[PDB]
Amino acid sequence: GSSGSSGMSLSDWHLAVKLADQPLAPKSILQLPETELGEYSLGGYSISFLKQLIAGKLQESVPDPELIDLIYCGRKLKDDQTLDFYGIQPGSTVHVLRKSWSGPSSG
Numbered sequence: 841g842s843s844g845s846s847g848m849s850l851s852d853w854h855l856a857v858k859l860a861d862q863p864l865a866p867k868s869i870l871q872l873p874e875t876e877l878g879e880y881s882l883g884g885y886s887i888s889f890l891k892q893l894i895a896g897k898l899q900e901s902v903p904d905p906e907l908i909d910l911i912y913c914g915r916k917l918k919d920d921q922t923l924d925f926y927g928i929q930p931g932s933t934v935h936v937l938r939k940s941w942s943g944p945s946s947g
Contacts, residue, residue: 849874850871851871851872851873851874852879852930853871853872853879853882853930854869854870854871854930854931855869855870855871855872855890855930855931855932855933855934856868856869856870856931856932856933856934857869857870857894857897857898857933857934857936858933858934858935858936859898859901859935859936860911860935860936860937860938861901861936861937861938862901867933868897868898870890870893870894870897872885872889872890872893881924882923882924883922883923883924884922884923884924885922885923886919886920886921886922887910887917887918887919887920887921887922888919890910890917890934891905891908891909891910891919892905894910894934894936895908895936898936902936902938903938903942907938907939907940908936908937908938908939909936909937909938909939910934910935910936910937911934911935911936911937912926912928912932912934912935913926916937917934
């Protein structure tokens with residue numbers, strides 16, 4: 841199998857991502873991968889994970905998943921919480937917030 845393993849699959853669970861820095865920018869759709877568990881309400885995922893997925897899609901603006909954060913329901917989400925803990929559902933929209941500026945002040 842020289843070719844290898846190529847060709848991701850489409851997931852059911854979907855989520856909306858909005859750039860807090862740009863409230864005018866169009867909302868993006870983030871489709872998280874499947875888990876060893878069934879399909880029923882995830883209720884187990886950890887915010888930390890999301891902070892990565894989103895940061896990976898918004899790489900256009902977001903520098904890194906560690907230099908950013910996730911905001912939901914008007915409140916930040918720690919990496920010690922779960923989707924069920926907050927009550928997040930497949931359809932809501934979260935907002936990304938940058939911890940600080942790169943460094944070289946400009947515009």
